[PDB]
Structure formats: structure tokens, C-alpha cells
Amino acid sequence: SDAVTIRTRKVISNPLLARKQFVVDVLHPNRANVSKDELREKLAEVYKAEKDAVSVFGFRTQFGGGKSVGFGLVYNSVAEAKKFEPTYRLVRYGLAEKVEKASRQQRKQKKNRDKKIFGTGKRLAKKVARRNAD
Amino acid sequence: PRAPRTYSKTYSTPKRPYESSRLDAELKLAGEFGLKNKKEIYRISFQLSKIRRAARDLLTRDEKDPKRLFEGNALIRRLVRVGVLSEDKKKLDYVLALKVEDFLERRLQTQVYKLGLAKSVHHARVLITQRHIAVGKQIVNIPSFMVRLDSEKHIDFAPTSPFGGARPGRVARRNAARKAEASG
Amino acid sequence: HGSLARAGKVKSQTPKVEKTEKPKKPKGRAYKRLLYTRRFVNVTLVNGKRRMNPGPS
Amino acid sequence: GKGKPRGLNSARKLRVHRRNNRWAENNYKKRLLGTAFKSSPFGGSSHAKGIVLEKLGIESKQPNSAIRKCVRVQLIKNGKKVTAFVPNDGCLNFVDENDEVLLAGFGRKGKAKGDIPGVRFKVVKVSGVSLLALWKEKKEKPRS
RNA sequence: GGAUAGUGGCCUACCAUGGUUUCAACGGGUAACGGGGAAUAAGGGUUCGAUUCCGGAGAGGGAGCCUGAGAAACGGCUACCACAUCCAAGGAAGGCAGCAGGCGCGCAAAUUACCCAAUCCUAAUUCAGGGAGGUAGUGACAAUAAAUAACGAUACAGGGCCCAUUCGGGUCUUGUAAUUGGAAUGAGUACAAUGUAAAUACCUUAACGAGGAACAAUUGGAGGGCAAGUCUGGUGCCAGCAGCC
């Protein structure tokens, strides 16, 4: 790009979650938009921590272009990020795997199934076998 | 459950519709200040009516009345901030007197025309809505602006459009491709 | 006089004429521009009382 | 003098006197009695579906001379018989019989509009097909 | 005195005959839940308020009750009434005025979708669950902004001023135009990033995207109130128009 000049604003250290938080602006002219991974590597080298440790979310583009503004958040390390952050944030960064599930309606259906069943099920299985034998 | 969003209009239709004097006056205003809508005209008249009711029901009160002081100073402050009022006429009777023409000349489109980036208020309109303008370092595409005079000091063309550079044009590149094929 | 018939008489009996072609007119602020430049800088009909639809006189 | 008392403790006399005079007023009466809901055909509703049964050739009141081509309608929710002015030209031929038409009022709040006596209501649609649309051929009525 | 968690006709035993009323009791009606408020106004006021918030009532109509701190619970039981289902006819299971969705009623009202990412709540509890809630789909209910077109030169017609050397120039005008040219982005396609739980939209910007045949703004109305035809054709108190005349 041409002079992104990523600049942080309102920085503050929160030692309780053991992190530091700020609202950040990038100035991109002659340029469609920055990317999240680009922003993360830039903040990792300007604040020296790690790429998988620094985080970002938001980044609305100001009208007409020429700049965007969002929230950037660096952690004390990768392990701190992994333990504290949400799974959706980790998986959109690529640091973890989004566990696959079915539809919520299907989870509720199987929930109703094993709610209508009582006990483990082996006895009912043997009973249904002995019943459907004839 | 979600607390309901306030909404309220910013215009009011005429009490009595068909008065040729009124109609010709607001048509005069639209065709000289480059407008599309008697809606917009009513809107400006509604702002003027709002401030006029405020001015009346404030100047009704005695001097050194802290209500009069506070509300009149805030009205003065925003009127000087927008430039509809001057920087040396603070006696509240000019506020009683002020004009839809004053509001319209403080708008952006005819301001652009006075600054000379248009050659016609309609040209100013099409430049505003096609975003070949910016008052600060960010583009705006609304005629109805009520400028704050820092914009006035800071007018220029759109940086991210020709007449302020950075690109020749969509149809410019189109014509260039045409001439490239012709030369080829 | 037994006229519970004849409905649609003149609408059926009318000689069908159709709208001639013409360019699409200015829209919106352009229309108000046309109205201003027709009514005021065009001084075309100011005889005594400013007609707007002059019948052929 | 003037009639109306003036004492500082007679507001009761004032309200009850005013109550009687409001009963003498027009719209207070029919509103508080619910004539629109108990005796009027619509039931105070803005419109109403209906089924035409036959045609009527009401002549125009004086000073005028015409025949107004209205119709006879029955409602559904009520089952009351209503007359209705088929407004425009040819629309009667459009709305011949059995049609599940829509009716509304004239614009005079329970009275007849012009030289059209006995009629307070008119037709606006035909089974979900508008009469102006039929008249200008922007749409067309399902034939069957 | 019983009952209540508690006062008290709350209920019982005995006793006195009282209590409310034209300052509208009691009975009837209500398209009556009340209120914070909404429309509307010089003042006074009138009308509405089912409806996001507060307090009430109800779970098809009534009655009863277990568990529990808290229910007269209904997404808890028991019976009756009216509804309605599955039957290998012996029997069994239900209450969408919860979210979607359907029939009917009508003038009159959305998808049988995605997510717990937020806002909160619950549990033994950070971790789970939540049609509470958020997202998207339908959506011209209402509100904000705002495209549909502009600009230069070429053929006519002007107004100041210079020459006042005739009606020659008109320097400059501002419109009239089967004149001509450019540049100028948007609607829509977007590669993409961003958006968000995942998205789809907004904003961003590549690449593609007008000369009107282009990308085509309708709805009312022209005798008055009430602004806008003494125009053309058809009709002939017929058809029809018109809120009032």
C-alpha cells in the first residue's frame, strides 16, 4: 500500500484481563482497504508482542474512503489470548478450530428424543428387540 | 421491549395551499437557489419558524433573566457557528428578522457557486451529488449542509476525483481506450 | 326513457386517438429550473394578467 | 344576568348543563350512542366486502336529468341490503352480477353526495380488482 | 371464638338495627384494563391511550389442590362443561391470548429461517441452556437524507457602455434551439477486503457500467372556493362529471 500510517488512540493497559486496549485509525488513500491480517502483522511489529497475540475487530471505513477506524487490542502473549478470548475470535483469526454442529433445530430435536427416553437405553434396546421379534 | 426510536419530521406543510404570491415566492427561491422540493423549502421555513417561536418566547422575558441569558446565548452561539447570523448583530431583533434567503445562502450548493467551482448552481448540485467536492478531508454528497465556516475556509475539490487529481476519470479512461484502439 | 342500457356509450363511440411521441421532460430540480426559466426570464406572456395556458387567439 | 351561573361552587351545575347541551350537539350524540355500530350498515368500518344481487336504474334528482346505474348489494358480516353507485363509465358492464365487490362511503359521512338519492356508498374493487384499473385496462378482471 | 402469616363479618354463636342516598346511592350500558403519555391548539380545551415502560387480570369457561419461600401455576395436576386426536375398540394423551405457521373472521396485518456473538436471566455454576433477546426474510404503517440530469462552443433575441463615424462593431450578457462535442459519477454488476457468531446489506475501492430509443415519475386537477384552457375531435340533460355551487 501507500502510507497506511496505522495509528493507535486512547491506549490503556488493563492488567486485570492482562492486556492493553485502544481504538485505532488507519489512513489509506489510493487504496481500497486494509486487511485484518495486514493490520495484525503491522501492530505485532510496532508493539513487539506477536501476530497471533495481537487482536482487532470493527474497522468501519469513514465515508468517501481515505481512512477507516476500528478497535485494536494487544495481549501480553499468545497463551493469554488463547485462554481469555472467545472461540469465534480465535477461529476467525485461525488460531483454533470452529467445532462443527448441526442446526439448532436438530439439536433441539435430539434433545427432545433423549428427553422422551429415560435411563441409559440398553434395557429399552433389548426390550424393543424382544418386542419387534414378532 | 427495545425502547422505541424517536422520530419527528423536519418540515410542515402550508396551512392554506393555493396562494399565488406564496407559490411564486417559494418557486423563486427554488429556481434561484437550485432546489428540487417545496419539502426542502418548508423544511427551511420550519427551522425559521422554530427559532422565531423561541426568539419570541425568550425576548418576552425581562433582561438579566438567567433563562433569557442561557437560551439566547445558545441560540446566538449556534447562529454565529453556522453563519446565518453575522458576527456583530446579537440584539435578537435581527433573529426576528432573518430570512430563508439567509439560510439558503449559508447552504453548501450556492456556497460552492459563490466560491466558483460550479459555473451554475445546478452544476454545483450535480457536483455535490456526484461527490466531486469535499469540505474537509472527507467527501460529502448532501446539498443541505448549514456550513460551520471552517468548511468555508477549507473548501477544495474532491481529492479522490479529478479537478483535485488522483485519477483521470472513468469515461476518461474509456475515451483513452477508444483512442488506443483507433491508434492501433 | 328506458336508459338502463347505453352504459359505456361515449367511451365506446369515441374516436380513438393516441399519444404522440415527445422527449422525456426534465425531472425534479431540473423541472423547477424549467419552471423558473419559463416563468421569469422568459417574458413570453405578460400581456395584462400572466396566463399560463394560452389558447390559440 | 346572562343565564349561566357564576358562583365558585357550581361546577356541577355547569357540567350537567353542558352534558345536556352536548346531547343536543350532533357528533357527540351518534358517537356516544354508537349509531355507526348498531344501526349503520358498515359498522363504522372504512370499507366492506359485499355481493351484488341485481341492478338499479335510479334517475337523478332535480335540477338534472340522467340515470345513475347503481346496484343492490348485500354484506357478509351483517347481511344488510345496500345500494351502491357504480362510479364510472362502462363499469356497470364490468361489474354485472355475483361479484364480491368492495364498498366505501361517498365523503359526506352517511348521506347522499349529489343528484344520487338513497345512496351513500360506492364500489372500489371487484374480487381484488380495482375499477379504475378495469376502466383504463391497466389490469383485468378474472373472467370466471 | 375459629381461621389467617397477620388486623378485620374473613367465618361462626349471641345481641343492637343499622349502613348508602338528588353533594346522583343502587341498577343498566360501554366498539372500558388504569397510568407514564399520543394527535391537536394563543389562552381555555376536545379526542384518543389494545399497543415497547409501571401496576393489574387471564391461559378454552369455571371450581379445587400437591410440591415449594413464592402459584389457586395451566409449556403442574383433579373433575365437570363445550372442543378435539390416536386406537391391533381394551384404553390413552391435549390445551399457540409464547415463536414461526395454518383454517375461519374479515376493509385490516410478515419466514413453519440463523445465533446465543452481544443485553440480561437461571443452575451446583466462568464453560451449559434460553423463539427472553439479537440477526436476516416479507414490509410504500409511519420518520431522515436524496438519483432521474448538468457543462463548453455553433443559428436567433436582448442591456448596460465605448466610439455616437449612419441600423456598424457589439466587446461581456442570459435565454430560445431536428446543433455539435466532450468530460461526470450514481442505480446495477465487486474481483476483493471490511461487515458480522457465519453471513446478506451499509461505507471502501479495483474491473465493467448514459446522449436520451437512453437507465424513459407518477398521482390529482384546470368555471369558482382553488392555481391551472373561451384549444381540437366525439357525445347531445344520453353516457357521465362534481366533497359545495
CB atoms within 10 A of CB D94: 20
Distance from C-alpha of A5 to C-alpha of A11, rounded to nearest angstrom? 17
Distance from C-alpha of A64 to C-alpha of A86, rounded to nearest angstrom? 33
Q: Where are the alpha helices (DSSP H) in chain A?
A: 36-46, 78-84, 87-93, 104-116, 122-132
Distance of residue C5 Cα from the nearest chain B Cα, in angstroms: 42
**Which contiguous run of DSSP H or E holds residue C32?**
helix C29-36
- φ/ψ of residue D61, rounded to 5: -60, 165
The data reach a resolution, in angstroms, of 3.9
B8 touches chain A (CB under 8 A): no
Q: Considering its fold, how many domains does chain D have in total?
A: 1
Question: Would you say C46 and C54 are in contact if contact means Cβ atoms under 8 Å apart?
Answer: no
Distance from C-alpha of B85 to C-alpha of B79, rounded to nearest angstrom? 5
CA end-to-end span of chain B: 68
Question: Would you say D116 and D68 are in contact if contact means Cβ atoms under 8 Å apart?
Answer: yes
**Identity of the residue in A30, A63, A67 whose CB atom sits nearest the CB atom of B166:** A30
Burial status of residue B48 (CB atoms within 10 A of its CB: 0-12, 13-18, 19 or more): middle
Question: What are the extents of the domains in chain B?
Answer: 17-184
Contact C36 B27 (CB under 8 A): yes
Q: How far, CA to CA in Å, does B15 sit from each of A131, B29, B50?
A: 85, 19, 16
**Which contiguous run of DSSP H or E holds residue C12?**
helix C9-13
DSSP C40: I
Question: Would you say D91 and D134 are in contact if contact means Cβ atoms under 8 Å apart?
Answer: yes
Distance from C-alpha of D4 to C-alpha of D21, rounded to nearest angstrom? 13
Question: Would you say D54 and D48 are in contact if contact means Cβ atoms under 8 Å apart?
Answer: no
Query: Which chain B residues are Cβ-neighbours of C42 within 8 angstroms?
Result: none
Gap from D35 CA to E81 C1', Å: 37
- Is any atom of nucleic acid chain E found less than 7 Å from the CB of residue A65? yes
- All three cell numbers of B1, joined, read 421491549
Q: Which residues contact D30 (CB under 8 A, 6 or more apart)?
A: D36
Query: Which chain C residues are Cβ-neighbours of B35 within 8 angstroms?
Result: 29, 32
Distance from C-alpha of A48 to C-alpha of D27, rounded to nearest angstrom? 81
Partners of D74 in the β-ladder: D51, D81
* Antiparallel, parallel or unpaired: β D121-126 and D81-85: parallel
C33 touches chain B (CB under 8 A): yes
B28 touches chain C (CB under 8 A): yes
Distance from C-alpha of A51 to C-alpha of A43, rounded to nearest angstrom? 8
Q: Which residues contact A70 (CB under 8 A, 6 or more apart)?
A: A23, A24, A25, A56, A57, A58, A59, A60
Helix B66-82 crosses helix B38-59 at what angle (to 10 degrees)? 150
Distance from C-alpha of D3 to C-alpha of D25, rounded to nearest angstrom? 19
Question: Would you say A27 and A67 are in contact if contact means Cβ atoms under 8 Å apart?
Answer: yes
Edge-to-edge, what's the strand order for the sheet holding A19-26?
A7-14, A19-26, A68-75, A54-61
Distance of residue C15 Cα from the nearest chain D Cα, in angstroms: 16
Question: Would you say A10 and A73 are in contact if contact means Cβ atoms under 8 Å apart?
Answer: no
SS (H, E, C) chain D: CCCCCCCCCCHHHHHHHHHHHHHHCHHHHHHHHCHHHHCCCCCCCCEEEEEEEEECCCECCCCCCCECCCEEEECCCCCCEEEEECCCCCHHHHCCCCCEEEEEECCCCCCCCCCCCCCCEEEEEECCCEHHHHHHCCCCCCCC
Distance of residue C27 Cα from the nearest chain D Cα, in angstroms: 24
Q: How was this structure determined?
A: cryo-EM
Q: Which residues contact D110 (CB under 8 A, 6 or more apart)?
A: D36, D40, D120
Query: Which chain B residues are Cβ-neighbours of C28 within 8 angstroms?
Result: 36-37
**Identity of the residue in B31, B34, B37 whose CB atom sits nearest the CB atom of C35:** B31
Q: How far, CA to CA in Å, does A92 sit from each of A41, A80, A101, C10?
A: 15, 17, 17, 73
Question: Would you say A58 and A24 are in contact if contact means Cβ atoms under 8 Å apart?
Answer: no
Domain coverage including residue D14: 1-144
List all nucleotides in chain E with at least one atom under 7 A from a protein Cβ: 23-24, 31, 47-48, 52-53, 105-108, 113-118, 129-134, 142-152, 174-176, 182-186, 191-199, 202-209, 212-214, 216-217, 220, 222, 226-231, 233-235, 237-245
- All three cell numbers of A19, joined, read 492486556
Distance from C-alpha of A112 to C-alpha of C47, rounded to nearest angstrom? 88
Residue with cell 359526506: D108
Gap from D47 CA to E57 C1', Å: 34
- φ/ψ of residue A111, rounded to 5: -65, -45
Torsion sign over Cα D13, D19, D24, D26: positive
Q: How far, CA to CA in Å, does B161 sit from each of B127, B158, B164, B167, D117?
A: 11, 5, 6, 6, 69
User: Are chains B and C in contact at 3+ CB pairs closer than 8 Å?
Assistant: yes
**Is omega for the bond preceding D63 within 30 degrees of 0, making it cis?**
yes
Question: Would you say B116 and B156 are in contact if contact means Cβ atoms under 8 Å apart?
Answer: no
Q: Which residues contact C47 (CB under 8 A, 6 or more apart)?
A: none
- All three cell numbers of B119, joined, read 459555473
Per-residue CB contacts under 7 A with strand E, chain C residues 4-33: 6-11, 13-15, 23-30, 33
- All three cell numbers of A44, joined, read 505485532
Contact C29 B27 (CB under 8 A): no
Question: Would you say D95 and D71 are in contact if contact means Cβ atoms under 8 Å apart?
Answer: yes
Question: Would you say A12 and A74 are in contact if contact means Cβ atoms under 8 Å apart?
Answer: no
A38-43 contacts: CB < 8 A, separation 24 or more?
A38/A4, A39/A6, A39/A72, A40/A93, A42/A4, A42/A6, A43/A6, A43/A72, A43/A74
Distance from C-alpha of A63 to C-alpha of A99, rounded to nearest angstrom? 37
Among A71, C47, C43, C11, residue whose Cα is nearest residue D134 = C11
